[PDB]
Ligand binder design. Structure first.
Ligand code: HEC
Ligand code: HEC
Ligand code: HEC
Ligand code: HEC
Length: 107
């Protein structure tokens, strides 16, 4: 596996960029996010060509927005799906981890 980033990295949407910090996620398996594709490890950017490269649609497996924000029955864990579970146990973090504004993702 490539080196984990040791600084926040950009996650570019069509119109917003959110910084993603690996450090809070150190106990999360890499593969939870960097899921296998065709049975093989991959660490390419989520919005890479051939992956979640629809940066404007809100739904569909190609939609970057959907795979970040869906709280529905997806095939891998999205940011908001896991954060919803975290804030159930740590409700002081509700705005920080799930808010659409003034959150840690969208300050
Ligand atoms: C979800 C909570 C993650 C966990 C756990 C790990 N990574 Fe990650 N990584 C994640 C995102 C959302 C991004 C940004 C991707 C983008 O589309 O811009 C990254 C970035 C990386 C990179 C750079 C390449 C890339 O995919 O952009 C590397 C090399 C990387 N991450 C490695 C890595 C490893 C080795 C992890 C476990 C120790 C790991 N990440 C965990 C999301 C998440
Ligand atoms: C191309 C090599 C990809 C990269 C890099 C990433 N994803 Fe992906 N993702 C890809 C496929 C072919 C699929 C569908 C098959 C499956 O394995 O379920 C997915 C699926 C997801 C999902 C589920 C979406 C659904 O509709 O159920 C999520 C939540 C997801 N991917 C997230 C995700 C993230 C956060 C990534 C960067 C860290 C990422 N994927 C990389 C192809 C590829
Ligand atoms: C569980 C499997 C997670 C997934 C998937 C993602 N995140 Fe997460 N995130 C998780 C935890 C346990 C925490 C720490 C909560 C605590 O107890 O402190 C976080 C934290 C963040 C933060 C806040 C960092 C800070 O400012 O302190 C951010 C900005 C964040 N997470 C972003 C993020 C994104 C964009 C994700 C999908 C690519 C994502 N997280 C997935 C657990 C999990
Ligand atoms: C971190 C866990 C997030 C929280 C909380 C919320 N959003 Fe988010 N959002 C996040 C990322 C990683 C990105 C960039 C990648 C992508 O394209 O999804 C975004 C981006 C947006 C955008 C812009 C989309 C674009 O194409 O530029 C919008 C409109 C947006 N996010 C809305 C939104 C809402 C409604 C939220 C509350 C439920 C919310 N976000 C929370 C990460 C995170």
């Amino acid at each position: 596996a490539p080196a984990v980033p040791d600084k926040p990295v950009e996650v570019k949407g069509s119109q917003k960029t959110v910084m993603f910090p690996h450090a809070p996620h150190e106990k999360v398996e890499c593969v939870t996010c960097h899921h296998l594709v065709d049975g093989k490890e991959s660490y390419a950017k989520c919005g890479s060509s051939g992956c979640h490269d629809d940066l404007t649609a809100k739904k569909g497996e190609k939609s970057l927005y959907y795979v970040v924000h869906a709280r529905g029955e997806l095939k891998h864990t999205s940011c908001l799906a896991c954060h919803s579970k975290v804030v159930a146990e740590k409700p002081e973090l509700k705005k920080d981890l799930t808010g659409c504004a003034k959150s840690k993702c969208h300050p």
